[PDB]
Design a protein around this motif. Structure first.
Motif, PDB file in Angstrom:
ATOM      1  N   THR A  56     -14.266  28.446  -0.783  1.00 25.68           N
ATOM      2  CA  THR A  56     -14.965  28.203   0.472  1.00 25.68           C
ATOM      3  C   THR A  56     -15.691  29.440   0.981  1.00 25.68           C
ATOM      4  N   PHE A  58     -18.486  31.845   0.951  1.00 23.30           N
ATOM      5  CA  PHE A  58     -19.814  31.711   0.369  1.00 23.30           C
ATOM      6  C   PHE A  58     -20.190  32.938  -0.447  1.00 23.30           C
ATOM      7  N   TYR A 167     -31.456  31.925  -1.739  1.00 23.73           N
ATOM      8  CA  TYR A 167     -30.530  32.797  -1.024  1.00 23.73           C
ATOM      9  C   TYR A 167     -30.525  34.200  -1.617  1.00 23.73           C
ATOM     10  N   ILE A 266     -10.508  24.149  11.696  1.00 21.01           N
ATOM     11  CA  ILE A 266      -9.947  24.619  12.963  1.00 21.01           C
ATOM     12  C   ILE A 266      -8.738  23.790  13.363  1.00 21.01           C
ATOM     13  N   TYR A 376     -22.256  34.036  17.005  1.00 18.36           N
ATOM     14  CA  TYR A 376     -20.999  34.690  16.664  1.00 18.36           C
ATOM     15  C   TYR A 376     -21.225  36.140  16.261  1.00 18.36           C
ATOM     16  N   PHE A 438     -16.245  37.723  13.546  1.00 19.14           N
ATOM     17  CA  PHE A 438     -17.306  37.906  12.559  1.00 19.14           C
ATOM     18  C   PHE A 438     -17.112  36.985  11.359  1.00 19.14           C
ATOM     19  N   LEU A 439     -15.915  36.998  10.770  1.00 15.03           N
ATOM     20  CA  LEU A 439     -15.697  36.290   9.511  1.00 15.03           C
ATOM     21  C   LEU A 439     -15.695  34.780   9.708  1.00 15.03           C
ATOM     22  N   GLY A 440     -14.964  34.292  10.705  1.00 14.33           N
ATOM     23  CA  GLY A 440     -14.784  32.876  10.919  1.00 14.33           C
ATOM     24  C   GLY A 440     -15.569  32.273  12.057  1.00 14.33           C
ATOM     25  N   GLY A 441     -16.306  33.070  12.815  1.00 12.13           N
ATOM     26  CA  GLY A 441     -17.096  32.538  13.903  1.00 12.13           C
ATOM     27  C   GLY A 441     -16.331  32.476  15.208  1.00 12.13           C
TER      28      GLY A 441
ATOM     29  N   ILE B 781     -20.531  20.485   2.225  1.00 11.63           N
ATOM     30  CA  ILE B 781     -19.175  20.396   2.749  1.00 11.63           C
ATOM     31  C   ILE B 781     -19.309  20.192   4.250  1.00 11.63           C
ATOM     32  N   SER B 783     -17.533  19.317   6.583  1.00 13.24           N
ATOM     33  CA  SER B 783     -16.454  19.677   7.492  1.00 13.24           C
ATOM     34  C   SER B 783     -16.563  21.100   8.017  1.00 13.24           C
ATOM     35  N   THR B 784     -17.481  21.906   7.489  1.00 14.67           N
ATOM     36  CA  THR B 784     -17.598  23.312   7.851  1.00 14.67           C
ATOM     37  C   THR B 784     -18.840  23.614   8.676  1.00 14.67           C
ATOM     38  N   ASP B 786     -21.487  23.269  12.045  1.00 14.73           N
ATOM     39  CA  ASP B 786     -21.647  22.987  13.470  1.00 14.73           C
ATOM     40  C   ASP B 786     -22.920  22.168  13.640  1.00 14.73           C
ATOM     41  N   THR B 805     -19.106  21.471  17.254  1.00 10.53           N
ATOM     42  CA  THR B 805     -18.730  22.477  16.277  1.00 10.53           C
ATOM     43  C   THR B 805     -17.761  21.888  15.255  1.00 10.53           C
ATOM     44  N   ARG B 806     -17.531  22.640  14.176  1.00 11.88           N
ATOM     45  CA  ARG B 806     -16.639  22.155  13.131  1.00 11.88           C
ATOM     46  C   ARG B 806     -15.221  21.960  13.646  1.00 11.88           C
ATOM     47  N   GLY B 807     -14.850  22.641  14.725  1.00 10.48           N
ATOM     48  CA  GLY B 807     -13.579  22.410  15.373  1.00 10.48           C
ATOM     49  C   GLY B 807     -13.560  21.247  16.333  1.00 10.48           C
ATOM     50  N   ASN B 826     -16.617  13.217   9.630  1.00 10.70           N
ATOM     51  CA  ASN B 826     -16.548  14.005   8.406  1.00 10.70           C
ATOM     52  C   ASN B 826     -16.378  13.121   7.180  1.00 10.70           C
ATOM     53  N   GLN B 853     -20.848  28.580  11.032  1.00  9.64           N
ATOM     54  CA  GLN B 853     -20.608  29.668  11.968  1.00  9.64           C
ATOM     55  C   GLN B 853     -19.480  30.523  11.416  1.00  9.64           C
ATOM     56  N   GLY B 854     -19.783  31.784  11.127  1.00  9.33           N
ATOM     57  CA  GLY B 854     -18.829  32.675  10.503  1.00  9.33           C
ATOM     58  C   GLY B 854     -19.370  33.236   9.209  1.00  9.33           C
ATOM     59  N   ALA B 855     -19.105  34.515   8.944  1.00 11.81           N
ATOM     60  CA  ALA B 855     -19.651  35.152   7.753  1.00 11.81           C
ATOM     61  C   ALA B 855     -19.080  34.571   6.469  1.00 11.81           C
ATOM     62  N   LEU B 857     -18.661  31.482   5.653  1.00  8.88           N
ATOM     63  CA  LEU B 857     -19.346  30.264   5.248  1.00  8.88           C
ATOM     64  C   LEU B 857     -20.767  30.508   4.764  1.00  8.88           C
ATOM     65  N   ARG B 860     -25.781  29.230   5.940  1.00 13.85           N
ATOM     66  CA  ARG B 860     -26.138  27.824   5.804  1.00 13.85           C
ATOM     67  C   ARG B 860     -26.776  27.352   7.104  1.00 13.85           C
ATOM     68  N   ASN B 861     -28.074  27.070   7.058  1.00 12.21           N
ATOM     69  CA  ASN B 861     -28.837  26.647   8.228  1.00 12.21           C
ATOM     70  C   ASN B 861     -29.846  25.607   7.768  1.00 12.21           C
ATOM     71  N   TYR B 862     -29.626  24.350   8.144  1.00 13.54           N
ATOM     72  CA  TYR B 862     -30.446  23.243   7.677  1.00 13.54           C
ATOM     73  C   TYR B 862     -30.976  22.450   8.860  1.00 13.54           C
TER      74      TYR B 862
END
Ligand SMILES: CCCCCCCCCCCCCCCCSCCNC(=O)CCNC(=O)[C@H](O)C(C)(C)COP(=O)(O)OP(=O)(O)OC[C@H]1O[C@@H](n2cnc3c(N)ncnc32)[C@H](O)[C@@H]1OP(=O)(O)O
Ligand code: HEM
Ligand SMILES: CC(C)CCC[C@@H](C)[C@H]1CC[C@H]2[C@@H]3CC=C4C[C@@H](O)CC[C@]4(C)[C@H]3CC[C@]12C
Ligand SMILES: CCCCCCCCCCCCCCCC(=O)O
Ligand SMILES: CCCCCCCCCCCCCCCC(=O)O
Ligand SMILES: [Mg+2]
Lengths: 485, 872
Positions: A56, A58, A167, A266, A376, A438-441, B781, B783-784, B786, B805-807, B826, B853-855, B857, B860-862
């Motif tokens: 997961t 990236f 990318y 989450i 974030y 940073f890592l998870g938002g 994916i 589920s990840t 927002d 958001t994904r949460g 989802n 959202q988060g480094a 992941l 990813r921006n679509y």
């Protein structure tokens, strides 16, 4: 400064909570293997028994796939070409390596990638001819912004069959931003267009590579003194051994623990135990550390074989106890770039408190914008700017003669070290929280803030702070070796 | 590769069905975003309080809290019924609810009609009217009073009447409102019930707020400050409350409340225009700037409860300005300047606000047939040149009741410019120059080019010529002065011209005029101190131009006569109006402001309206022109009777001139009906092209009240004789077409209009449908991410609509909160936007967005391609 037994006890406690929380994360991963696999498609491989990898993340999967496919071969080719140039045409080695860098960029990103890199480099050079720092920075920021434009993104995506190539181009241009900004700002012979092309099209750092100062690059590409071939092979062998060890460690972490999948869900992260939360945070930060250890040890190894001195690799995150040390020793290349070209030009920390706040704010804002400029990222930047500012303020306050004299008179040196460790505990907790943002938002940050600092204020917070206090004692003891000088 | 596909978007158009039975059937069938009966909308309009709580208007958040505290959602639904005669002909519609305020107004009407009959020597009619009033008061005190809560409420018309003969129990659920003290104002309440009501309305927890007597008690479930009819204080309901209190022996408390209102109402002592209502808590003003209705009731307060020469009142209202747009609107689409109108004229003038407009009266606010539009920023602006060098002047511009004065003083040259109104179409300017040396006078003018703005910021780059190509303004020189001609424009909502309208400037001096497109320049030379007279005339028809040529020739022959006539007229205005001896200067200034506002909102006969009339606001967006309402007219005639009885009589006559007479062509069944709105242009059904003319309903009946007030002030028996048959017919209509039960207690409702039913006679209702966008993501994916929904309205940037958001955390834009609901699946990898209560602002291209959202992941921006959503 402390009894040997006491420091041994602190180190034992630090390793204890590290490994116990890792075990808890492993247990939670085993419990929810089916759910996570259904929701995030854990990968299957034979590297570690029947365990399934967590792909997961990236960056890790992206760079591993690229290295399997093309980048490893191109890096080996750069190594061989550099050695051949050193043996045959030493005085022309910079230009041979420039040609190889352009060819490798063409091989992976095709003609459009090389064309875009050249366009950015030429625009930056032409703007730098106007020897103004503001114009150069404005040009670099505009070029960086163009990467985030929807129309430009669509045009770029139309060039490549797969999204991975796009990318890769985006990352390459993002790093080229720092590289040609460095060249242009230093420019304000030895600063001609061929040298700029050699600097930009230096393959070891073309994709994702750490910012290597142009001064060092040009100085060490014109040396004309090189190490014997056998020494180069020995260095390559040791570097490859360490790189394989680090890669195996990262793969083992991804197999045993599914920190990335858990952070993605989450709802799951909100119902795991507190030990699982701490272990997830530790595993995330350490996996990021090992990931960039691997991602900078290949460029670093190639630069070392080329005779350059690469920026020092990140220091173990399990030895970082403060914002200042964290951002001095993690990304040394980018830290030096920010110090020379962002922090100091805006006064650094030599123009009073307000100047220091403004300089830190500008540095972290630029870093967040470079990383994407997402909400974030801006949050992470705000938190880390606040942490660094508070640390500088406290350091200055303690450094005042009155405060220092009062501390010496009232508290024993052991008491002073214990107080320092207590403060570094809170500093480390906030640093971990910001880096988790940073890592998870933002969702991960909210979850951790609520479950550690709000919903668990009485005892969860104090337990975390005590473990981080032992950790900070052990971290300061180690920092005495290098932080002093 | 991640791909996002939008779906479910399209053009949402409300479908209109017919039949009362079908409406009930549809409601039972359910599955509709909302149902909307135009007849019920007209019924809400007829009550005069279009969003009052008593009529079932409660916000969704207020309704949710009301249910959470215990209460059915059906408590706020007002059933709608259609009134059919014995023959089966459709007389109209009425809410299945009898209003206490309407019953009290009918009661007051009955006693005023009885008094008029006694004056006219009709003892039998007077006795019958007193009997009707007595039985109506009995009904009010027996049915609409709640002993448990000790207040007056509306009563539902239930399927069966109660044992005592009442139609349903009082509606206590919907809270307390100003209608609860209407019986006190109208005298229907008994002494005990009056005491109970006064106790309730003197409670700071109910009505004794910062500004007392709002349109809803603080305890009302639907109460909200800043809601026009659910908490905001209107001066008229405040005066009704005070008048009822005084009527029932609580004059001291009424005086205390009046003092509180005077001290706390915002801007009352400032020189701003008189707006509509006040915040009950903060006291802030809102509404159309120069509101005749609020001004009238402020004058009534001055004459009743405020206790403690036109030159004495300077700058009572800020009449300075320099408009740059034909529509120089404020935040609420009303003109942000207050031009000076007087004597019924259809053009107004503003004072110079600085050196740029110094030398002339910049604003030229032409009252197009039903709207106010600025024609110029500078027009006929004097500039003086002595010895070839422009004379520098110091400006002193001020407005007194009935005149605009600006004095220009220099070292050697002084100019005094007095602007008064001479005739119902002409304004006379007196420019007297005092100098010891010859001067070269130069007049210059411009025509506005920009179209519209708000708070000074232009809304767009539209021009007057671009927006109205047929509006071909042309400045033409004339033997004396100037003239501007206009083309025929029939913009029913923005600008109306007949193609014969003109703005004529006539001067006493002979001048040399030069026209360059939309600007002119007139030059004259004088050998010394002289007085010159300029008449500005806005003429809306060729007949008006022909008639006013002679009037203009006469005005310039005796300008002093007309100036002194205007001065005297305003002297009697002030002498009659200001009859309160124990009032402080600030209260007298408020009274003068009210008088000026009322006289400025007075229009000469025009178009369909053949009588002098007063409109709610000359500068209002939808109140300008000669747009006359009966509800506003009653109170305006009540107030103006004390200082302008002739105009009050003319306003009442204007309202009743279009009262439906027997043998009517459009609505023969509505004999005695008084149209809700009469304006310059008739409705299409009556042969015109107006669009403002409203016959879908009437307003609450208070005509006998104002007619009796006019009689009391003037003591004219012929006035009562003239007005008695009209009031009797209107009362009879109220008893016929607005009494579903037949118990003599009327209900608010709507007429048999083309907007309410089909030609056959089936009630129309529009069924509104919701929109549900969808966004399926493939190759990701899901589920990840927002996921989010953006919309890009035309000519505007894309704005976030909602995000989940994904949460699962969900956020909505402030403009779509509650109306829109975003969810994600989802399992199906879809994102849905459930759009409800769509409005024209929601028309845009809606874009689905997926972003991690988060480094960890990655970047990813679509973005989705986008789908078009259009409504109305
Ligand atoms: C249990 C686990 C615990 C660990 C948990 C955390 C682990 C997290 C891992 C994962 C994290 C995710 C990755 C992070 C995401 C971003 S990627 C890495 C990017 N790095 C950054 O964004 C860092 C940005 N901030 C910084 O680099 C520094 O904090 C800055 C530059 C803002 C401040 O630098 P400083 O060195 O710390 O502060 P100084 O004032 O002391 O500057 C140092 C030197 O500059 C000099 N200086 C200052 N101002 C002047 C002047 N005007 N002129 C001359 N010189 C001057 C000054 O004299 C001084 O000289 P020195 O003592 O010899 O070193
Ligand atoms: C509190 C417990 C720990 C302490 C005190 C600690 C301390 C250190 C120290 C002193 C070094 C060498 C100096 C440096 O590069 O910073 C190091 C390196 C390293 N640590 Fe840790 N560490 C801890 C836990 C961990 C964990 C849980 C991991 C799991 C990934 C880890 C992974 C590494 C790696 C990969 C290196 C690089 C070794 C090399 O190639 O030189 N450490 N650590
Ligand atoms: C920045 C990028 C290019 C870094 C690439 C790092 C290099 C060293 C990585 C990328 C992919 C990796 C390979 C992935 C898979 C395997 C198979 C395994 O059975 C032995 C190790 C081996 C062969 C790895 C060796 C190291 C490797 C080649
Ligand atoms: C937001 C900062 C969190 C960083 C945590 C680092 C790891 C320290 C170990 C914490 C273990 C959990 C504490 C005990 C839980 C409990 O008492 O239930
Ligand atoms: C998120 C903002 C807060 C985080 C930063 C808190 C820093 C607290 C102080 C850290 C220790 C500074 C050095 C102390 C030296 C000593 O006392 O020996
Ligand atoms: Mg440093």
């Amino acid at each position: 400064m402390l009894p040997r037994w006491e420091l041994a006890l602190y180190l034992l406690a630090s390793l204890g909570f590290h490994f116990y929380s890792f075990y808890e994360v492993y247990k939670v991963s085993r419990e929810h293997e089916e759910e996570l696999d259904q929701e995030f498609e854990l990968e299957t491989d034979t590297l570690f028994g029947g365990l399934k990898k967590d792909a997961t993340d990236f960056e890790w999967s992206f760079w591993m796939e690229w290295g399997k496919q093309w980048l490893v071969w191109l890096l080996l080719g750069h190594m061989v070409v550099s050695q051949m140039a050193t043996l045959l045409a030493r005085k022309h080695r910079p230009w041979i390596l420039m040609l190889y860098g352009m060819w490798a960029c063409w091989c992976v990103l095709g003609t459009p990638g090389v064309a875009m890199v050249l366009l950015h480099t030429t625009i930056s050079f032409c703007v730098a001819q106007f020897r103004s720092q503001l114009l150069t920075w404005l040009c670099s920021l505009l070029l960086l912004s163009t990467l985030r434009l929807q129309g430009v993104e669509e045009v770029k995506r139309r060039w490549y069959k797969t999204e991975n190539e796009y990318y890769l181009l985006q990352f390459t241009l993002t790093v080229r931003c720092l590289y040609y900004t460095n060249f242009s700002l230093e420019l304000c012979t030895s600063y001609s267009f061929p040298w700029m092309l050699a600097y930009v099209f230096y393959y070891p750092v073309l994709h994702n590579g750490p910012i290597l100062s142009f001064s060092e690059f040009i100085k060490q590409m014109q040396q004309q003194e090189h190490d014997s071939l056998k020494a180069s092979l020995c260095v390559l062998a040791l570097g490859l051994g360490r790189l394989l060890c680090w890669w195996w460690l990262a793969e083992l972490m991804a197999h045993l623990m599914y920190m990335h999948a858990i952070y993605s869900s989450i709802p799951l992260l909100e119902t795991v135990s507190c030990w699982t939360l701490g272990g997830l945070a530790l595993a995330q930060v350490l996996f990021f550390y090992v990931k960039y250890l691997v991602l900078f040890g290949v460029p670093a190894l190639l630069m070392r074989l080329d005779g350059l001195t690469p920026p020092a690799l990140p220091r173990c995150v399990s030895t970082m106890f403060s914002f200042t040390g964290m951002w001095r020793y993690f990304d040394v290349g980018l830290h030096n770039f920010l110090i020379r070209y962002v922090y100091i030009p805006v006064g650094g920390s030599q123009h009073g408190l307000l100047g220091t706040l403004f300089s830190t704010a500008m540095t972290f804002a630029f870093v967040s914008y470079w990383h994407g400029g997402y909400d974030y990222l801006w949050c992470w930047a705000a938190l880390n700017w606040l942490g660094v500012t508070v640390e500088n303020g406290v350091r200055r306050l303690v450094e005042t003669p009155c405060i220092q004299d009062s501390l010496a008179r009232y508290f024993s040196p052991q008491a002073r070290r214990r107080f320092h460790a207590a403060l570094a505990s809170c500093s480390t907790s906030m640093l971990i929280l910001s880096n988790l943002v940073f890592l998870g938002g933002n969702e991960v940050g909210k979850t951790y803030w609520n479950r550690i600092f709000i919903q668990g204020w009485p005892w969860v917070t104090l337990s975390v702070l005590g473990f981080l206090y032992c950790y900070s004692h052990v971290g300061i003891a180690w920092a005495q070796t290098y932080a002093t000088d | 590769q991640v791909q996002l596909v939008e779906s479910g978007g399209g053009l949402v158009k409300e479908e209109t069905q017919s039949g009362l039975n079908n409406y009930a059937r549809v409601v039972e069938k359910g599955q509709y975003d909302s149902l909307e009966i135009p007849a019920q909308v007209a019924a809400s309009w007829e009550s005069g309080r279009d969003d009052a709580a008593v009529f079932g208007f409660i916000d969704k958040e207020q309704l949710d809290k009301y249910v959470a505290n215990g209460g059915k959602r059906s408590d706020w639904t007002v059933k709608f019924a259609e009134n059919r005669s014995q023959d089966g002909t459709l007389l109209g519609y009425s809410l299945l609810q009898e209003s206490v305020d309407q019953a009290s107004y009918m009661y007051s009407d009955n006693h005023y009609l009885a008094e008029m009959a006694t004056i006219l020597g009709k003892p039998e009619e007077a006795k019958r009217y007193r009997q009707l009033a007595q039985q109506l008061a009995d009904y009010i005190n027996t049915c609409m009073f709640d002993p448990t809560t000790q207040f007056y409420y509306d009563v539902r018309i239930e399927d069966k009447p109660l044992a005592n003969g009442c139609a349903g129990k009082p509606i206590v659920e919907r809270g307390k409102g100003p209608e609860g003290w209407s019986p006190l104002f109208n005298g229907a309440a008994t002494q005990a019930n009056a005491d109970a009501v006064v106790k309730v309305m003197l409670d700071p927890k109910e009505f004794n707020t910062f500004v007392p007597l709002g349109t809803a008690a603080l305890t009302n479930p639907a109460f909200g400050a800043d809601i026009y009819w659910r908490g905001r204080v209107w001066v008229d309901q405040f005066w009704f409350g005070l008048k009822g209190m005084e009527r029932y022996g609580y004059r001291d408390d009424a005086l205390k409340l009046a003092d509180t209102f005077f001290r706390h109402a915002k801007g009352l002592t400032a020189d701003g225009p008189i707006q509509e209502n006040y915040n009950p808590l903060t006291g802030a003003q809102q509404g159309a700037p120069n509101f005749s209705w609020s001004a009238a009731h402020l004058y009534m307060l001055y004459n009743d409860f405020f206790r403690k020469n036109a030159d004495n009142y300077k700058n009572v209202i800020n009449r300075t300005g320099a408009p740059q747009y034909m529509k120089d609107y404020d935040y609420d689409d009303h003109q942000r300047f207050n031009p000076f109108f007087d004597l019924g004229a259809w053009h107004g003038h503003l004072l110079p606000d600085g050196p740029n407009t110094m030398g002339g009266f910049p604003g030229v606010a032409l009252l197009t047939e039903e709207y106010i539009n600025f024609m110029a920023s500078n027009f006929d602006r004097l500039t003086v040149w002595q010895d070839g060098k422009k004379v520098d002047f110091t400006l002193e511009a001020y407005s007194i009741p009935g005149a605009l004065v600006q004095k220009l003083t220099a070292k050697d040259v002084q100019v005094e410019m007095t602007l008064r109104f001479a005739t119902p179409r002409t304004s006379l300017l007196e420019t007297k120059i005092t100098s010891n040396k010859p001067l070269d006078l130069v007049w210059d003018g411009e025509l506005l080019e920009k179209l519209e703005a708000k708070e000074g910021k232009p809304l767009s780059d539209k021009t007057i010529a671009g927006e109205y190509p047929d509006y071909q303004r042309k400045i033409s020189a004339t033997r004396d002065g100037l003239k501007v001609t206009f083309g025929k424009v029939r913009a029913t909502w923005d600008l109306l011209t007949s193609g014969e309208s003109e703005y004529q400037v006539h001067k006493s001096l002979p001048v040399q005029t030069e026209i360059n497109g939309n600007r002119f320049t007139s030059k004259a030379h004088i050998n010394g101190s002289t007085t010159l007279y300029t008449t500005y005339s806005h003429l809306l028809t060729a007949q008006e131009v022909s008639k006013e040529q002679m009037q203009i020739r006469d005005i310039l022959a005796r300008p002093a006569f007309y100036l002194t006539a205007s001065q005297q007229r305003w002297e009697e205005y002030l002498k009659k109006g200001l009859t309160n001896p124990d009032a402080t200067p600030e209260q007298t200034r408020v009274a003068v402001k009210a008088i000026e506002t009322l006289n400025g909102n007075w229009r000469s006969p025009g178009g369909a309206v053949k009588f002098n009339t007063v409109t709610p606001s000359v500068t209002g967006r939808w109140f300008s022109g000669n747009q006359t309402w009966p509800w506003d007219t009653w109170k305006q005639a009540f107030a103006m009777a004390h200082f302008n009885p002739d105009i009050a009589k003319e306003n009442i006559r204007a309202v009743f001139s279009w009262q439906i007479q027997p043998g009517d062509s459009v609505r023969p069944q509505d004999v005695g009906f008084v149209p809700d709105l009469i304006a310059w242009n008739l409705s299409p059904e009556r042969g015109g092209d107006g669009g403002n003319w409203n016959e879908r309903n009437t307003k609450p009946s208070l005509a006998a009240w104002s007619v009796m007030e006019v009689y009391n002030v003037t003591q004219d028996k012929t006035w009562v004789a003239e007005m008695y048959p009209k009031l009797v017919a209107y009362h009879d209509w109220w008893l016929r077409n607005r009494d579903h039960n037949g118990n003599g207690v009327p209900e608010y409702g709507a007429t048999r209009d083309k907007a309410h039913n089909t030609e056959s006679g089936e009630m129309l209702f529009t069924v509104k449908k919701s929109l549900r966008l969808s966004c399926t993501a493939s190759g990701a994916i899901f589920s990840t991410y927002d996921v989010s929904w953006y919309r890009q309205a035309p000519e505007k940037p894309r704005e976030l609509v909602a995000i989940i958001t994904r949460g699962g955390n969900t956020h909505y834009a402030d403009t779509v909160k509650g109306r829109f609901t975003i969810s994600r699946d989802n399992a199906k990898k879809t994102v849905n936007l459930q759009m409800n209560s769509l409005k024209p602002e929601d028309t845009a291209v809606y874009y689905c967005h997926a972003g991690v959202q988060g480094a960890m992941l990655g970047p990813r921006n679509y973005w989705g391609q986008g789908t078009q959503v259009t409504v109305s």
